[model samples]
Target: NKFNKEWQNAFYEILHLPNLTEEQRNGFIQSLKDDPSVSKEILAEAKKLNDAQAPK
Candidate 1:
């Protein structure tokens, strides 16, 4: 998936946020959703990450 490597990298960068605020996390995920250049795979990954961090 070389096509999404950049997006994948972007995804991983945010994924490791040690202190990601709730607002910041949602903002980033929403921004990814709004990005026309973002792939579904990346968006899905972001959502999955966001969901995992959410209150259980």
Candidate 2:
């Protein structure tokens, strides 16, 4: 509800990281979602950054 620090490190990189396997990506998302930085709060920002950075 303030500066929005939750999504800064959503680890979307892990999602987009090269040479990644389906199992690895899925598993990482699982681990990451459990992580504090991947909180529901910053999920909007995550998509926000991802959408724009990944292009419109």
Candidate 3:
């Protein structure tokens, strides 16, 4: 419940990791959704972090 700056930074770093393709981004989002403990708020924020500023 306490989503902090470090968590947000880590999320950004993970999504920007080497070889982070669109497939990987989508996959990550899907994985988060499949993860039972991941809250909807967390998942939605993660999706945007992966999609934001990305090419079409």
Candidate 4:
């Protein structure tokens, strides 16, 4: 449960890593949906985080 969220956030944090792409962002969003432990609001937030900002 927690690991899924961690992986999603980590994917965001390291999105700039070589070979990473917005498709990866989509993957994280999908994970948020696939993981019942995660909620829609949280997924939406993560989606926005991925779409609207680049991790620094």
Candidate 5:
């Protein structure tokens, strides 16, 4: 349980990354019982990160 935070944060961070596919991103969120809002806004600004970082 000591390292659970790291695991959970890592998993959540991936959902925030627009570089992932819609299928992959949604799948992760679904696996967590649907946490779509935590990173919803961050996804919108991904275009500013890089063209290659856009949602596929």
Candidate 6:
């Protein structure tokens, strides 16, 4: 869990990238979840952040 904070910060970095579409956002999130490189806990947090950042 040492990198939990770092993971959260990286998530925000991805979130703030310019011109991200709803499709692009969801696609990147799904890719993160599917990729074995990403930790499960971080993927869960990413999903939450994705949902929150989506256009209303």
Candidate 5 root-mean-square deviation in Å: 9.2
- Over 1-56, each residue of candidate 1 has an lDDT whose tens digit, in order, gives 43456665666666565456766666665665567376555556655665667664
lDDT of 1 at 49: 66
Model 3: ten consecutive residues of lowest lDDT: 1-10
Highest TM-score among the candidates is held by which one? 1
For candidate 5, the 10 contiguous residues with the lowest summed lDDT are 41-50
Q: Which residue runs of candidate 6 sit more than 4 Å off their true CA positions?
A: 1-10, 38-56
Q: For model 1, what is the error of residue 13's alpha carbon versus the real structure, in angstroms, after optimal superposition?
A: 1.5
RMSD of 3: 9.0
Q: Give the per-residue lDDT of model 6 (tens digit) for 1-56.
A: 64465555555655665446666656665655465356455455555665666576
The global Cα lDDT (0 to 1) of model 5 is 0.51
In candidate 2, what are the lDDT values of residues 1-56, reduced to their tens digit? 32244433445655665444566556656755566544554444445544555422
Provide the lowest-lDDT 10-residue window in model 1: 1-10
Quick one: best lDDT, which candidate? 1
Score candidate 4 by TM-score against the native. 0.32
Where does the lowest 10-residue lDDT sum fall in candidate 6?
A: 33-42
- For residues 1-56, what per-residue lDDT tens digits would candidate 5 score against the true structure? 43345446645675667566777666655644444344343333333443566546
Q: Using alpha carbons, what is the TM-score of model 5? A: 0.37
Q: After superposition, how far is residue 28 of candidate 4 from its true place, in Å?
A: 0.4
lDDT by residue (tens digit), candidate 3, 10-41: 45655665445777666665654455355445
Cα lDDT, model 5, residue 51: 50
lDDT of each: 0.60, 0.52, 0.55, 0.55, 0.51, 0.57
Q: What shift in Å separates residue 19 of candidate 1 from its native position after superposition?
A: 2.4
Please give the lDDT score for candidate 1: 0.60
